Structures are given as structure tokens and as C-alpha cells.
């Protein structure tokens with residue numbers, strides 16, 4: 001599949017840089033014909049078939065195909081796609097209130113009510129994705145953006161669909177590996193992956209929201225990965241002594257090694273607490 005090959009600068013003016021991933025740069029932009037503002041994500045293409053730099057065309061096309069499918073309040077959406085010799089340029093919905101990662105660093109830790117207010121929205125977005133058989137595979141606070149960080153109950157959108165895959169057989173078996181602190185044991189062990197890996201990541205995010213601390217983090221990436229595979233985490237009294245047992249129960253039912261025994265997204269919404277790259 002091919003994308004619009006006119007120069008993106010003929011249609012948009014770019015501004016502030018917002019983020020800078022590995023093979024991607026994100027800049028705020030403005031469409032000339034409407035005045036509306038977006039985030040332009042420039043993804044570097046591979047320069048040869050055998051090249052390690054850049055993103056393969058297969059991987060770019062998959063990300064674009066997934067983004068085109070989605071429309072939900074808690075997920076980023078896609079406005080347009082351009083390309084040239086060096087980059088594919090995704091014109092995405094602008095989410096201007098920064099990352100959940102940076103919001104958390106300012107608060108130290110959240111109350112249970114603040115945590116559930118964020119978590120309910122994350123769960124709603126993942127329920128939508130999993131309903132479409134989309135596994136995100138890279139859920140972490142850096143990939144949760146706030147629409148406006150200066151309101152009592154900030155609204156969020158899930159971003160960064162660069163690892164997302166459609167799971168048409170209940171599992172997939174490709175080269176997929178996200179950030180060590182957040183990956184499930186089946187990722188660490190190179191086993192077939194499905195929608196359950198995202199539920200593990202949600203358990204990690206919940207632990208962090210409540211404590212300010214990362215449950216499996218070691219001093220090196222390999223140590224983190226070993227901790228994940230062994231389910232080597234515990235609720236430290238210093239952080240959790242006054243956290244409700246139901247919050248701990250929710251986390252416990254997500255941080256389960258066997259993916260078949262982990263809570264599904266539907267389970268998580270009925271849980272009583274809720275119910276109303278890898279190498280150094």
C-alpha cells in the first residue's frame with residue numbers, strides 16, 4: 001500500500017517537537033486548509049532489505065492499517081499518511097497534555113481514586129482494542145497521553161501503535177518485544193503472544209500508579225527480564241501499607257505467569273475494585 005507522496009510541507013506547517021523515539025520524531029503541526037492542529041510522526045524507513053536501521057515497510061503498513069481501523073475516545077486516531085524516500089509521516093490526533101509518565105513524576109504516587117480514574121479509561125481503550133482483536137504490545141505510562149494535564153480528572157488516550165498486531169488466531173508468533181519493565185513473561189520467553197500480554201502490562205502500570213515504583217525493575221535489562229519471568233515482585237509495606245486489599249487483589253490477578261489464568265479485559269471491568277530493544 002502506498003501513501004500520499006506530495007511534500008507534507010505543502011499542506012502543513014510544523015512547530016515544536018513533542019517526542020523523539022528510536023526511529024521516530026513527533027512534531028506539532030497545523031493543516032493549512034483547516035487551521036487544525038495535529039502531531040506528525042516521522043518514521044524512518046529502511047534503506048536496504050538487510051538493514052537494521054529504520055522500520056520495515058511491512059511493519060509500517062501494519063501500524064497504519066491498525067490505526068485506520070480505530071475510533072474511540074481513549075485511543076489516538078489517524079488523520080492522514082504521507083511518505084517520501086526517507087520517512088512515512090503519520091498525521092495523528094494531537095494530544096497536548098503530556099505523558100502519564102511525566103504526570104506521575106510530578107505527583108510521586110496517585111491515590112486509589114486518582115489511579116482508578118486513569119485506569120478506567122485505559123481499560124476502556126484496551127476493551128475497544130481487544131474487541132477488535134488488536135493487541136497493543138507496548139502499554140506503559142510513556143504511551144498514555146493526557147488531553148489536558150491541568151484538570152482534576154485528566155482524560156487520556158493510548159498512543160504508539162508501532163508494536164500492535166491483529167490476533168486472528170488467538171495468538172501470534174513473530175518478533176515482538178516491548179520495554180523490559182512492562183513485558184509479560186511470554187514475551188521474555190519468546191512464546192506465542194496474544195491479548196493476555198496487554199493485561200500483564202496493565203498490572204504493571206497499576207502497581208506503578210499506586211506506589212511510584214516499578215515491580216520487576218532490576219539494575220540491568222537482563223535482570224528485569226529475569227524478574228518478570230520468575231514473577232519476582234511483592235507489595236512493599238512502605239508503599240502499600242495503606243492501599244486497599246482490593247487494589248492488591250486486582251494487581252495479583254493480572255501479574256500471573258500463565259496467560260490463560262490471567263484476568264481478561266472483560267474480567268478486569270467486572271472486578272470489584274473497578275466495577276461501579278530488549279538488549280543492552
Ligand SMILES: c1cnc(N2CCN(c3cc(-c4ccncc4)cnn3)CC2)nc1
Nearest residue numbers: 018019026039093094095096142143159160
Ligand atoms: C521514552 C520517552 N518518551 C516516550 N514517548 C514519548 C511520546 N511518544 C509519542 C508521542 C506521540 C504524540 C501523539 C499525539 N500528540 C502528542 C504526542 C506519538 N507517538 N509517540 C512515544 C512515547 N517513550 C519512551
